[PDB]
Amino acid sequence: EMVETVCGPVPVEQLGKTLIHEHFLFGYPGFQGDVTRGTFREDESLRVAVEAAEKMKRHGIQTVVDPTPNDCGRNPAFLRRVAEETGLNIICATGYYYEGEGAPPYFQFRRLLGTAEDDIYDMFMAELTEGIADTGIKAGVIKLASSKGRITEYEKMFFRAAARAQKETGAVIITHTQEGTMGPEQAAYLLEHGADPKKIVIGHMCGNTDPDYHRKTLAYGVYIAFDRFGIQDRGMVGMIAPTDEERVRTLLALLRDGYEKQIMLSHDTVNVWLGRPFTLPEPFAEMMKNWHVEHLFVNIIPALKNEGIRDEVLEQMFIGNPAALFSA
């Protein structure tokens, strides 16, 4: 009945309206090496993060899960300052970024020592139950991710460690999938290893526009997240994301099938980029103009209500699902 937040344990019944995937700070691994030209401006960053939090609060949001991975600039103390300033509950994660073009050598080195999976498991337990770094702050979720079209051997170490930690703690697992792939594979692999489907959120499911893919994932009993609202088409340099229009189409088909108790919604904003600032060129910026923490509320919700979605169903997704997810 409690969940760990950056301000300590909070009753799950008090989380209220929740955004399941948003980043106050985020940096792509490697940002740390660009410290000279890409210094962290903590005061200015706290201001921007506090403003983002207040914009969420504008729409009744009481809780945010910020699943920034350990190698992507996760900063629990900074998050505590945001929470203390705004009264928002913020839940952070323990986890590493997916492999990408290739695995970082640290845990690859330890795999060759034969201890990597055990070390990762130990990291998860420490961070879920003892405290992160120089603080007593505990993570409330394990963050996993897989690559496009495969869960790599590197990534599987974290999946196995997460299932183990999940069994010991009852902690929630949040994932990120790359380019609308591996949703069924993620669920199947975690479930093979004894993870509880009612404690799993398969992320970035909005990146696939085929409801049959969503149904194949939903059949495992897991939650899914349409968590990149506002990231449209070629707006971000990485991939080609779907449009919001396509997300909404996909979502409405699932809500019409009555899957509302398995779906959560978010934007995956990055409110402060770590490392050196950058700009997007004119036409793509236009594609990203709605990528902000209010978008779901001021744009997506009214579209859904005009399409016949009731407040009961919306509140199931924003309130009921997070409460169930984080409950025993």
Q: Which residues are annotated binding-site positions for Fe(3+)?
A: 21, 23, 143, 176, 204, 268
Asked whether position 74 contacts Co ion by CB under 5 A, the answer is: no
User: Is residue 192 exposed (0-12), middle (13-18) or buried (19+ Cβ within 10 Å)?
Assistant: exposed
Of 14 and 115, the one with the shorter C-beta distance to a copy of itself is 115
Cβ–Cβ under 8 Å, residues 153 and 146:
no
Q: How many residues bind a copy of itself (CB under 8 A)?
A: 51
Strand 172-176 and strand 141-145: the pairing is parallel
Annotated binding site for Mn(2+): 143, 176, 204, 268
Annotated binding site: 21, 23, 143, 176, 204, 268
How far apart are the C-alpha atoms of 244 and 229, rounded to whole Å? 6
User: Is residue 238 exposed (0-12), middle (13-18) or buried (19+ Cβ within 10 Å)?
Assistant: exposed
Q: Pick from 32, 170, 210, 283 the residue near a copy of itself by CB under 8 A.
A: 32
Q: Could you tell me which stretch among 42-50, 125-133, 232-240, 262-270 binds Co ion (CB under 5 A)?
A: 262-270
Choosing among Co ion, a copy of itself, none, which partner's interface includes residue 14 (Cβ < 5 to 8 Å by kind)? none
| Residues 6+ positions from 97 with CB-CB distance below 8 Å | 28, 29, 69, 71, 72, 145
Asked whether position 99 contacts a copy of itself by CB under 8 A, the answer is: yes
Q: Pick from 8, 11, 30, 221 the residue near a copy of itself by CB under 8 A.
A: 30
Residue ranges in contact with a copy of itself by CB under 8 A:
27-37, 39, 69-71, 96-97, 99-110, 112-115, 119, 122-123, 126-127, 130-134, 237-238, 275-276, 278-281
